[PDB]
mmCIF file of C-alpha atoms in Angstrom:
data_model
loop_
_atom_site.group_PDB
_atom_site.id
_atom_site.type_symbol
_atom_site.label_atom_id
_atom_site.label_comp_id
_atom_site.label_asym_id
_atom_site.label_seq_id
_atom_site.Cartn_x
_atom_site.Cartn_y
_atom_site.Cartn_z
ATOM 1 C CA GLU A 1 50.450 -55.409 -20.229
ATOM 2 C CA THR A 2 50.128 -54.940 -23.987
ATOM 3 C CA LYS A 3 52.167 -51.967 -25.210
ATOM 4 C CA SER A 4 50.885 -50.110 -28.266
ATOM 5 C CA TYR A 5 52.474 -47.308 -30.258
ATOM 6 C CA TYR A 6 50.839 -44.742 -32.525
ATOM 7 C CA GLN A 7 51.726 -42.800 -35.661
ATOM 8 C CA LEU A 8 49.702 -40.216 -37.540
ATOM 9 C CA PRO A 9 49.512 -41.489 -41.137
ATOM 10 C CA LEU A 10 51.478 -39.592 -43.786
ATOM 11 C CA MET A 11 49.353 -38.458 -46.759
ATOM 12 C CA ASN A 24 55.912 -22.369 -57.543
ATOM 13 C CA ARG A 25 55.408 -20.666 -54.206
ATOM 14 C CA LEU A 26 57.585 -21.996 -51.375
ATOM 15 C CA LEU A 27 56.380 -22.732 -47.833
ATOM 16 C CA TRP A 28 58.686 -23.831 -45.010
ATOM 17 C CA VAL A 29 56.834 -25.460 -42.102
ATOM 18 C CA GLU A 30 58.937 -24.775 -38.995
ATOM 19 C CA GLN A 31 59.068 -26.939 -35.867
ATOM 20 C CA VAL A 32 55.607 -27.341 -34.333
ATOM 21 C CA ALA A 33 55.648 -26.249 -30.690
ATOM 22 C CA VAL A 34 53.866 -28.373 -28.092
ATOM 23 C CA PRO A 35 53.494 -27.908 -24.311
ATOM 24 C CA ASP A 36 54.979 -30.366 -21.830
ATOM 25 C CA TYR A 37 51.782 -32.367 -21.297
ATOM 26 C CA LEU A 38 51.641 -33.303 -24.992
ATOM 27 C CA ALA A 39 55.416 -33.743 -25.359
ATOM 28 C CA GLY A 40 55.698 -36.951 -23.340
ATOM 29 C CA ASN A 41 55.690 -40.463 -24.681
ATOM 30 C CA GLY A 42 52.071 -41.187 -23.821
ATOM 31 C CA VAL A 43 48.940 -40.136 -25.620
ATOM 32 C CA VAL A 44 46.816 -37.828 -23.496
ATOM 33 C CA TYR A 45 43.327 -38.522 -22.184
ATOM 34 C CA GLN A 46 41.361 -35.798 -20.422
ATOM 35 C CA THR A 47 39.656 -37.623 -17.532
ATOM 36 C CA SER A 48 37.631 -34.697 -16.149
ATOM 37 C CA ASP A 49 37.036 -30.960 -16.467
ATOM 38 C CA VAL A 50 40.435 -30.401 -14.790
ATOM 39 C CA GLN A 51 42.723 -33.397 -15.403
ATOM 40 C CA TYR A 52 44.770 -34.726 -18.335
ATOM 41 C CA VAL A 53 46.476 -38.101 -17.895
ATOM 42 C CA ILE A 54 49.424 -39.381 -19.928
ATOM 43 C CA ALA A 55 48.923 -43.010 -20.940
ATOM 44 C CA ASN A 56 51.548 -45.463 -19.733
ATOM 45 C CA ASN A 57 50.981 -48.244 -22.292
ATOM 46 C CA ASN A 58 49.749 -46.304 -25.343
ATOM 47 C CA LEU A 59 52.581 -44.194 -26.674
ATOM 48 C CA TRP A 60 53.573 -42.150 -29.707
ATOM 49 C CA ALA A 61 55.937 -44.111 -31.965
ATOM 50 C CA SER A 62 57.966 -40.929 -32.532
ATOM 51 C CA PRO A 63 57.746 -37.481 -30.915
ATOM 52 C CA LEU A 64 54.301 -35.968 -31.415
ATOM 53 C CA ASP A 65 55.762 -32.585 -32.392
ATOM 54 C CA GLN A 66 57.651 -34.222 -35.267
ATOM 55 C CA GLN A 67 54.574 -36.196 -36.342
ATOM 56 C CA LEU A 68 52.430 -33.055 -36.349
ATOM 57 C CA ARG A 69 54.996 -31.237 -38.493
ATOM 58 C CA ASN A 70 55.484 -34.093 -40.966
ATOM 59 C CA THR A 71 51.769 -34.728 -41.454
ATOM 60 C CA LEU A 72 51.060 -30.996 -41.759
ATOM 61 C CA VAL A 73 53.651 -30.851 -44.561
ATOM 62 C CA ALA A 74 52.166 -33.905 -46.302
ATOM 63 C CA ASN A 75 48.575 -32.699 -45.873
ATOM 64 C CA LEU A 76 49.378 -29.187 -47.119
ATOM 65 C CA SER A 77 51.350 -30.583 -50.066
ATOM 66 C CA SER A 78 48.317 -32.561 -51.216
ATOM 67 C CA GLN A 79 45.956 -29.561 -51.232
ATOM 68 C CA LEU A 80 48.335 -26.852 -52.538
ATOM 69 C CA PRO A 81 49.401 -28.058 -56.003
ATOM 70 C CA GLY A 82 50.869 -24.654 -56.848
ATOM 71 C CA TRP A 83 53.116 -24.708 -53.770
ATOM 72 C CA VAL A 84 56.207 -26.574 -52.633
ATOM 73 C CA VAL A 85 55.793 -27.328 -48.914
ATOM 74 C CA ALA A 86 58.615 -28.782 -46.828
ATOM 75 C CA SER A 87 59.841 -29.269 -43.262
ATOM 76 C CA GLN A 88 63.326 -28.139 -44.309
ATOM 77 C CA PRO A 89 64.084 -24.617 -45.577
ATOM 78 C CA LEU A 90 63.434 -24.234 -49.307
ATOM 79 C CA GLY A 91 64.522 -20.772 -50.406
ATOM 80 C CA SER A 92 65.385 -17.291 -49.260
ATOM 81 C CA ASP A 93 62.046 -15.889 -50.532
ATOM 82 C CA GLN A 94 59.905 -18.640 -48.971
ATOM 83 C CA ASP A 95 56.899 -18.101 -46.796
ATOM 84 C CA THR A 96 57.041 -19.678 -43.338
ATOM 85 C CA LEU A 97 54.420 -21.410 -41.208
ATOM 86 C CA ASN A 98 54.835 -21.684 -37.432
ATOM 87 C CA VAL A 99 52.312 -23.724 -35.446
ATOM 88 C CA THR A 100 51.714 -24.207 -31.741
ATOM 89 C CA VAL A 101 49.456 -27.117 -30.775
ATOM 90 C CA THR A 102 47.976 -26.675 -27.296
ATOM 91 C CA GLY A 103 45.381 -29.484 -27.439
ATOM 92 C CA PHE A 104 45.665 -32.927 -29.054
ATOM 93 C CA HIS A 105 43.914 -35.423 -26.838
ATOM 94 C CA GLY A 106 40.913 -37.589 -26.143
ATOM 95 C CA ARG A 107 38.301 -36.747 -23.539
ATOM 96 C CA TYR A 108 36.201 -38.811 -21.137
ATOM 97 C CA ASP A 109 33.011 -38.274 -23.147
ATOM 98 C CA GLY A 110 34.384 -39.652 -26.415
ATOM 99 C CA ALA A 111 35.345 -36.297 -27.880
ATOM 100 C CA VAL A 112 38.746 -35.565 -29.313
ATOM 101 C CA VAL A 113 40.185 -32.072 -29.081
ATOM 102 C CA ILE A 114 42.652 -30.248 -31.338
ATOM 103 C CA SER A 115 43.620 -26.685 -30.543
ATOM 104 C CA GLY A 116 46.396 -24.199 -31.104
ATOM 105 C CA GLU A 117 47.478 -21.252 -33.210
ATOM 106 C CA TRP A 118 49.312 -20.826 -36.514
ATOM 107 C CA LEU A 119 51.342 -17.949 -37.948
ATOM 108 C CA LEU A 120 52.025 -17.476 -41.665
ATOM 109 C CA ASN A 121 54.849 -15.068 -42.562
ATOM 110 C CA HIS A 122 55.281 -13.650 -46.078
ATOM 111 C CA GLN A 123 58.263 -11.255 -46.114
ATOM 112 C CA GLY A 124 57.147 -9.877 -42.772
ATOM 113 C CA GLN A 125 53.418 -9.743 -43.519
ATOM 114 C CA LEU A 126 51.573 -11.910 -41.024
ATOM 115 C CA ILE A 127 48.404 -13.933 -40.676
ATOM 116 C CA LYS A 128 47.947 -15.350 -37.166
ATOM 117 C CA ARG A 129 44.915 -17.550 -36.420
ATOM 118 C CA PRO A 130 43.741 -19.686 -33.496
ATOM 119 C CA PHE A 131 42.107 -23.037 -34.111
ATOM 120 C CA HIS A 132 39.928 -25.325 -32.019
ATOM 121 C CA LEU A 133 38.297 -28.493 -33.346
ATOM 122 C CA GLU A 134 36.254 -31.108 -31.521
ATOM 123 C CA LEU A 135 35.267 -34.418 -33.102
ATOM 124 C CA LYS A 136 33.355 -37.377 -31.717
ATOM 125 C CA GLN A 137 34.930 -40.812 -31.506
ATOM 126 C CA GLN A 138 32.372 -43.375 -32.682
ATOM 127 C CA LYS A 139 34.080 -46.573 -31.436
ATOM 128 C CA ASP A 140 35.975 -46.960 -28.177
ATOM 129 C CA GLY A 141 39.702 -47.305 -27.613
ATOM 130 C CA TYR A 142 42.989 -45.515 -28.215
ATOM 131 C CA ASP A 143 43.204 -46.696 -31.833
ATOM 132 C CA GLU A 144 39.977 -44.840 -32.658
ATOM 133 C CA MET A 145 41.057 -41.825 -30.587
ATOM 134 C CA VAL A 146 44.233 -41.497 -32.659
ATOM 135 C CA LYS A 147 42.388 -42.145 -35.922
ATOM 136 C CA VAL A 148 40.013 -39.275 -35.136
ATOM 137 C CA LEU A 149 42.877 -37.000 -34.018
ATOM 138 C CA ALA A 150 44.526 -37.640 -37.394
ATOM 139 C CA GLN A 151 41.245 -36.814 -39.164
ATOM 140 C CA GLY A 152 40.939 -33.575 -37.196
ATOM 141 C CA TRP A 153 44.562 -32.663 -37.895
ATOM 142 C CA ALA A 154 43.863 -33.201 -41.592
ATOM 143 C CA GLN A 155 40.822 -30.924 -41.249
ATOM 144 C CA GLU A 156 42.965 -28.204 -39.686
ATOM 145 C CA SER A 157 45.465 -28.607 -42.521
ATOM 146 C CA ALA A 158 42.574 -28.050 -44.942
ATOM 147 C CA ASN A 159 41.612 -24.874 -43.042
ATOM 148 C CA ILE A 160 45.168 -23.547 -43.338
ATOM 149 C CA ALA A 161 45.358 -24.462 -47.030
ATOM 150 C CA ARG A 162 42.077 -22.663 -47.733
ATOM 151 C CA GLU A 163 43.570 -19.517 -46.195
ATOM 152 C CA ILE A 164 46.943 -19.925 -47.940
ATOM 153 C CA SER A 165 45.078 -20.233 -51.241
#
């Protein structure tokens, strides 16, 4: 009966982070739990406090800002000569064995020059429950932000 809501915590050269694309199964209200090799279930009582695609974008901006001191990173356009970052997140969920999964692809554009990279991370949840699942998803999303920053540097 208890309803719980979740938020990912929020942490020159110009970098505009565009809207993060997510598929339908991750774009609902509920956090996703993969119950088997084939099935992903949307929780009914454990929900994102704001749209996951917005949370992914805002935390990516904050995470990138903290590791790129020579850059200005924003979710709103910054300048005509800016670089752009477009991300698709195809996995962002817990799994029946205690793993959490983060997957997708990012595309950096500098005046038409491109770097396009897939990502896939899997982390183990140490304690049970949706709180820990989301904590570990946020940790993995921060790790992916570090991967992108290392490339951007």
